[PDB]
């Protein structure tokens, strides 16, 4: 299936994914396309942080969902 990732540019990209793909897999698929290192990726869907070791199907992420990348402002 196809999903969308909005990156911190504003640019939205598509990724080929399966529901059984891990988050770290999706993270890796992002590096493949955008160059962004997986250790720097923090993904948000539907007001929820996505954790490593969970699949897209755990979050019920379906075709054409939009995931959002964010960065930390630590304080």
């Amino acid at each position: 299936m196809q999903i969308f990732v909005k990156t911190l540019t504003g640019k939205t990209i598509t990724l080929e994914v399966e529901p059984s793909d891990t988050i770290e897999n999706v993270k890796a698929k992002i590096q493949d396309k955008e160059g962004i290192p997986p250790d720097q990726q923090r993904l948000i869907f539907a007001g929820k942080q996505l954790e490593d070791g969970r699949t897209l199907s755990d979050y019920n992420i379906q075709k054409e969902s939009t995931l959002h990348l964010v960065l930390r402002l630590r304080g």
């Binding site: 007001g47 929820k48 964010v70 930390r72 402002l73 630590r74």
Partner: peptide
């Protein structure tokens, strides 16, 4: 006990 992002904490407590 280290420094953290406000949005991340917020969503964490919300969930």
């Amino acid at each position: 006990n280290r420094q953290q992002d406000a949005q991340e904490f917020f969503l964490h407590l919300i969930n």
